[PDB]
């Protein structure tokens, strides 16, 4: 994977000694080239993960996330061009360095071989985002935002470290290939429950899970837009990639202690989706929407069925493209109106034709029209959960109905209706943010044509 | 203090510590401590401020008491063994007397209320020399006698250090005070692994030495002593405080910065010894150390603070002092994780 | 080699050259009292170097070519607002005094470097122990509130205790009704706007706090204007003085090592000029300070440390 | 007004002095060049040729081989009077059952 | 009530307050030397005999 790693780190010298105006052009073009090179990673064998090196390996689960990160990186590059114009060149290059460093840690995380190496770069993503959230934020609270996001993830991260090093002393290795191949049943000894626990809350705190999610509304609604997408699109999914990994050994414990988190989640998305319907800030809805969508994933991983894992993977990638779009969409409105209140700028279809479309299928992908990959992930979860328990259907079915309730609500309360006559600064929609939405949406329908590439290794 | 006397005063401190790390006789070890104390008290009160006198004083009574207790614990060991060699202690009371005798020199358990304000009163220069060099000697003694150590006592010494050091730092503004509690926090980390693998505390010592060094001579360059005084450095020196972020993150152990190497490597070793509950604990309570690191990070350059108009001609002038190894120290204090297996060089 | 601890270890001393010829002196005269004429007259005949009164832009002479920098980037204040309208909420008045304070810090600092590295005495126009005279006169005339004034002494005490008073000074005495005529006679339009009570407040503070507390640190040589135009007697008495009373004799080489060490690097000299005390005339906005700090950067030479700015020459940078 | 700070500058619109711009940056010539190159790279070969690459990828998880091999032993089971597929993946004779 | 009143009060604010509350008593030391070394004496005494770390 150094055919991706080496060019990615080579973006640092190139972006750090380019001209004072070419930093945006240079970073965007070669990051896209990295995305094209990363597209070759879509190739997967029947069941053998691509073992490029001793310390790097990939399969049908890592690559779709890998392409998601690499494809994403130019998207914040173009999104940040708007509000980063009024800055010095050296600080601007510092911003680009954080994004590239964030990307580089992401690729190493997904391509990691053993759990400890995965853990190091996994957590290492906290540092670049911590600077992004805090240094370049917009409001006073961002200082409290960073601490909330940092400690929450760390509070669960440290128990996993103790459990991980404990794995090495007991099993003899932490390599994922050996762990799955040398998998042994886990006893129900009272120590083993905490052993199971210490490998879980690390992944579910950043999912986020119901209860342990408050950093999500306190960061995504408050981070800079560029940091907002990568947080929602991929960073939450870091728990997903880990959980499919760590569950290979933590069996058959999952049968019992999934329950306290299952209905914690099962009552979760319905509860969270209710909060989304009754927000006042724009970005607060999508943030609360993200945990709601992430909640069905938690059930998908934990239930441990092949169908749910495919549904987990599809919903994971689909939500990333979606949540990035709505966060980008909110940023476009926030920039002109200098706020994020929902009913502040209702009724803008008459002035924003193309935006009103970009609202339209972005919300529809949030409603998950058929046959968008959102349903393909969502429906697979439903069938797996129903096979587990019939009474499941009412809950998340009601959730995706209250999900439908709000997912038109901002469409009504941002585009439908009459403009505000005192507002007179909604200028012609610039092609930059405009083309940004195009690059968000077309891969969604393109992947809809051939979804078979994003169901993970269980397909 | 005349420059020539200052050098010989320092050389006596280094010789005193060196005598501790090379001698095999208990009396000479005690002598090395005595010479170390004797040559250091003048160093603390180099500038003769009113604060430094009692700062140096609180140093003296604490360490003299520690030295006298150390001498007594040596004497009992001679009484019950007839040996002066540093192998082990053949009287449990003799050992159980030296742990605190060495602890107050290290400042770990409630034998620590001297560390904060002794750092505060004295200058920043001797503050660096106090919190880094003065710990090689007592730790070297502990490493040699690591065999016959009561694990229950030694672990409690460190656990108390981590809790108090982390808790105390949350309520400090004077940068020297927060450094002292942070140093006390690292005291427990090094000493917790002491009974199990002495190679590990040497590694943590070396990393902590670079952390405290690099942090301090950044403070010297910033010429700041309180959080507010540091805040204005963003207006004058942006790179110094921007570098101070990474060292602060590394000092908190936030990986992949070099500061994780001790916290990571230590945890791996004790889990080999079926210690699980305690390693989870310092993993938890290292976070309060991280708190006032980020608050320092927030106040320095993560958020530019109100400046002072008297800074114009300040920008017109550059530092004449020439901190060396500062560009080097940051490198070891930030990015040495890929060379983690090098701990076997110490082994 | 710059004078560091290494030179003292080598044996480099400055007491050997500290003699009767190393007199750092300055003529502390009233406004337009002819003190500059008296100071320069001392300079030519006594062999001492002349330090022109450190203004708002003297620091610009200490750094680089010496051209006065822009007001916003070399003080944020200027003198015309002081004289024309000495009452406003922006507080240009104290911003002048606070900035003008540091100028005489350097003017005395460079005065030290002259006579501790060579032993050759200097002449100035007023000094650090004259800036309070203007500030005290500033408060009595209703210019800037006392919160700035009470901060002034706190800053003054922590940037001058390490500083040793000069060898001698000269106080030229010109009657205050004549000075008001003199400022009116020159024709500088800002001099018209000056209140007459300001000049006598300068005269009062000169003979109320400066002259009394100076007497035990340097000799009193109070000379009238009738005693000032004649350039001889003002300097024969200097030679016929004693230079006995004062802290100069009891400053051994270890004090001089401490002295020159602190004053060699200005950073700690005025480190206490930027006290973390927020004041209306001193607290620049976070955004304002940020851009202004940037604004200082595009200026030539003020990008890297001196000797490295390729924009203003400094060839062979790749080896320097 | 103790904190001497410049007033909040009004946000600039990319189209005031550059109506025909693309909303990328201030200087025009690179603003088109930026637009030309992102509009090139994004929706072109990264998108199009990328789509052909994945769509025309070689055998992905080998399902064509599955069908080809499935038809082979589908015939074999149907030929020699055998069920299409037995109930034991591993032959029950080699597994040595305890007791 | 559930999210913004209880969740942030059931984990973040309680633990933050607990550290907030008793970080004061650790750090509110008046500095009396007699009181410091008195704590040394109690720690020295209870090190053995009472806690029997020597046994």
């Amino acid at each position: 994977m150094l055919k991706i790693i080496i060019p990615t780190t080579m973006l640092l010298p190139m972006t750090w000694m380019s001209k004072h105006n070419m930093i945006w052009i240079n970073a965007t073009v070669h990051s896209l080239l990295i995305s094209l090179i990363s597209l070759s990673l879509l190739n997967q064998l029947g069941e053998n993960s691509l073992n490029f090196s001793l310390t790097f390996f990939s399969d049908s689960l890592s690559a779709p996330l890998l392409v998601l990160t690499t494809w994403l990186l130019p998207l914040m590059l173009m999104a940040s061009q708007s509000h980063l114009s009024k800055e010095t060149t050296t600080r601007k290059k510092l911003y680009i360095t954080m994004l590239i460093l964030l990307q580089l840690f992401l690729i190493m995380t997904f391509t990691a071989t053993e759990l400890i190496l995965f853990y190091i770069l996994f957590e290492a993503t906290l540092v670049p985002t911590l600077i992004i959230i805090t240094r370049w934020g917009n409001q006073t609270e961002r200082l409290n935002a960073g601490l909330y996001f940092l400690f929450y993830t760390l509070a669960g991260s440290l128990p996993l470290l103790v459990a991980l090093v404990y794995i090495q002393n007991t099993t003899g290795s932490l390599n994922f290939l050996i762990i799955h191949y040398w998998s042994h049943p886990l006893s129900n000894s009272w120590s083993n429950i905490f052993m199971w626990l210490a490998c879980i809350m690390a992944f579910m705190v950043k999912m986020p899970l119901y209860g342990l999610h408050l950093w999500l509304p306190k960061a995504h609604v408050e981070a800079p837009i560029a940091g907002s997408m990568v947080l929602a699109a991929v960073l939450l999914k870091l728990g997903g990639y880990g959980m499919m990994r760590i569950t290979t050994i933590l069996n058959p414990l999952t049968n019992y202690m999934a329950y306290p988190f299952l209905m914690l989640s099962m009552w979760g998305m319905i509860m969270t989706s209710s909060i989304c319907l009754r927000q006042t800030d724009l970005k607060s809805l999508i943030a609360y929407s993200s945990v709601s969508h992430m909640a069905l994933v938690i059930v998908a991983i934990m239930i441990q069925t092949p169908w749910s894992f495919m549904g987990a993977t599809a919903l994971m990638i689909a939500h990333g493209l979606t949540s990035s779009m709505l966060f980008c969409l909110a940023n476009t409105n926030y920039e002109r109106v200098h706020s994020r209140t929902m009913i502040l700028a209702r009724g803008l279809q008459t002035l924003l034709p193309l935006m009103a479309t970009w609202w339209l299928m972005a919300s529809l992908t949030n409603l998950a029209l058929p046959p968008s990959i959102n349903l393909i992930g969502e429906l697979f979860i439903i069938t797996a959960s129903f096979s587990w328990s019939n009474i499941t259907i009412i809950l998340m079915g009601m959730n995706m109905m209250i999900t439908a309730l709000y997912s038109l609500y901002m469409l009504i309360t941002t585009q439908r209706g009459k403009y505000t006559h005192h507002i007179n600064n909604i200028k012609a929609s610039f092609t930059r943010e405009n083309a940004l939405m195009a690059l968000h949406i077309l891969p969604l329908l393109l992947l809809t044509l051939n979804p078979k590439m994003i169901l993970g290794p269980l397909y | 203090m005349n420059p020539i006397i200052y050098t010989t005063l320092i050389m006596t401190v280094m010789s005193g510590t060196m005598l501790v790390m090379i001698s095999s006789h208990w009396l000479l070890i005690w002598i090395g401590f005595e010479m170390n104390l004797l040559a250091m008290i003048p160093v603390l009160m180099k500038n003769f401020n009113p604060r430094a006198t009692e700062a140096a004083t609180k140093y003296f009574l604490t360490q003299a008491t520690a030295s006298m207790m150390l001498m007594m614990a040596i004497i009992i060991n001679l009484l019950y063994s007839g040996q002066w060699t540093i192998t082990k202690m053949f009287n449990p009371v003799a050992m159980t007397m030296m742990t605190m005798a060495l602890a107050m020199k290290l400042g770990l358990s409630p034998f620590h209320f001297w560390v904060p304000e002794v750092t505060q009163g004295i200058s920043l220069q001797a503050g660096l020399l106090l919190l880094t060099w003065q710990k090689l000697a007592p730790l070297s003694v502990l490493c040699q006698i690591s065999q016959s150590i009561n694990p229950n006592l030694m672990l409690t010494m460190a656990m108390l250090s981590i809790l108090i050091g982390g808790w105390g730092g949350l309520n400090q503004t004077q940068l020297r005070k927060i450094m002292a509690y942070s140093s006390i926090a690292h005291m427990g980390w090094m000493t917790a692994v002491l009974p199990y693998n002495t190679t590990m505390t040497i590694l943590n010592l070396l990393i902590y030495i670079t952390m405290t060094l690099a942090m301090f001579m950044l403070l010297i360059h910033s010429s700041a002593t309180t959080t507010l005084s540091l805040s204005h450095t963003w207006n004058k020196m942006p790179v110094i405080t921007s570098l101070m972020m990474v060292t602060l993150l590394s000092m908190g152990g936030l990986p992949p910065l070099s500061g994780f190497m001790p916290k990571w490597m230590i945890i791996q070793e004790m889990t080999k010894n079926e210690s699980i509950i305690m390693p989870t604990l310092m993993a938890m309570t290292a976070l309060l150390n991280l708190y006032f690191y980020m608050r320092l990070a927030y106040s320095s350059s993560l958020t530019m603070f109100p400046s002072t108009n008297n800074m114009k001609m300040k920008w017109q002038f550059e530092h004449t002092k020439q901190m060396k190894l500062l560009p080097t120290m940051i490198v070891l204090s930030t990015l040495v994780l890929p060379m983690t297996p090098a701990l076997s060089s110490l082994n | 080699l710059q004078y560091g601890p290494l030179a003292f270890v080598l044996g480099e001393r400055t007491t050997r050259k500290l003699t009767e010829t190393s007199k750092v002196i300055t003529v502390d005269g009233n406004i337009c009292s002819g003190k500059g004429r008296l100071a320069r007259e001392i300079a030519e005949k006594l062999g001492l170097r002349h330090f022109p009164e450190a203004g708002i832009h003297y620091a610009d002479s200490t750094t680089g070519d010496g051209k006065p920098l822009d007001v916003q980037l070399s003080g944020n204040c200027s003198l015309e607002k002081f004289y024309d309208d000495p009452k406003s909420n922006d507080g240009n008045s104290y911003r002048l005094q606070s900035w003008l304070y540091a100028s005489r810090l350097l003017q005395y600092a460079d005065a030290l470097e002259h006579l501790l590295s060579t032993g050759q005495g200097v002449v100035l126009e007023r000094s650090i122990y004259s800036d309070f005279v203007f500030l005290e006169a500033m408060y009595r005339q209703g210019f800037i509130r006392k919160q700035c004034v009470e901060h002034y002494n706190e800053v003054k005490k922590v940037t001058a205790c390490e500083y040793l008073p000069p060898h001698v000074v000269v106080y030229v005495d010109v009657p205050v009704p004549e000075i008001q005529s003199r400022i009116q006679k020159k024709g500088n339009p800002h001099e018209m706007k000056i209140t007459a009570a300001y000049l006598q407040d300068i005269e009062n503070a000169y003979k109320k706090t400066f002259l009394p507390e100076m007497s035990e640190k340097c000799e009193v040589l109070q000379y009238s204007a009738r005693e000032a135009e004649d350039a001889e007697k003002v300097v024969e008495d200097i030679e016929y003085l004693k230079c006995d009373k004062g802290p100069w004799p009891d400053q051994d080489d270890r004090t001089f090592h401490r002295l020159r060490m602190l004053v060699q690097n200005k950073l700690e000299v005025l480190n206490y000029t930027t006290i973390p005390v927020y004041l209306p005339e001193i607290t620049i906005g976070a955004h304002q300070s940020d851009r202004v700090f940037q604004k200082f950067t595009e200026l030539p030479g003020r990008k890297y440390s001196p000797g490295y700015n390729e924009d203003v020459g400094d060839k062979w940078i790749w080896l320097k | 007004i103790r904190l001497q700070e410049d007033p909040d500058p009004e946000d600039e619109n990319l189209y005031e002095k550059n109506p025909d711009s693309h909303g990328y940056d201030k200087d025009p010539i690179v603003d088109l060049w930026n637009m030309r190159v992102v509009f090139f790279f994004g929706f072109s070969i990264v998108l199009v040729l990328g789509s052909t690459f994945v769509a025309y990828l070689p055998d992905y998880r080998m399902q064509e081989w599955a069908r080809r091999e499935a038809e082979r032993l589908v015939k074999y089971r149907e030929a020699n009077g055998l069920p299409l597929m037995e109930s034991n993946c591993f032959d029950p004779n080699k597994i040595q059952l305890p007791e | 009530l559930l999210d913004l009143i209880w969740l942030e009060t059931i984990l973040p604010k309680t633990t933050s307050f607990i550290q907030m509350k008793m970080s004061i008593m650790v750090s509110n030391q008046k500095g009396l030397i007699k009181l410091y070394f008195l704590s040394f004496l109690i720690t020295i005494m209870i090190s053995m005999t009472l806690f029997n770390y020597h046994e």
Binding site: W136 | - | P276 | - | N28
Partner: peptide
């Protein structure tokens, strides 16, 4: 303009102890 620390934000930890109380009130 993004929010930046102001004077009253600087003074929150500007005391001798940046967590105050009655014991530390003097």
């Amino acid at each position: 303009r993004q929010w930046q620390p102001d004077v009253e934000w600087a003074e929150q930890f500007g005391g001798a102890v940046m967590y105050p109380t009655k014991e530390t009130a003097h």
